[PDB]
Ligand binder design. Structure first.
Ligand SMILES: *SCC1=CC(C)(C)N(O)C1(C)C
Length: 56
């Protein structure tokens, strides 16, 4: 299933999508993505929209 991540960073802005088994797995992918790009923010998840949001 497709989950979306919306990065509202101080330097990196945008959105992306990946296909994972569940929301628990999509997070780790999105958490790894953010770390590799030097993102430290506050995370939120909406299961009705399948959207992870990270804001610095
Ligand atoms: S999870 C981030 C968040 C929680 C809540 C208090 C419902 N909000 O309004 C935002 C989206 C900031």
């Amino acid at each position: 299933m497709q989950y979306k991540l919306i990065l509202n960073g101080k330097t990196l802005k945008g959105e992306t999508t990946t296909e994972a088994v569940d929301a628990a797995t999509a997070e780790k992918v999105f958490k790894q993505y953010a770390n590799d790009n030097g993102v430290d923010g506050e995370w939120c998840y909406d299961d009705a929209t399948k959207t992870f949001t990270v804001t610095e």
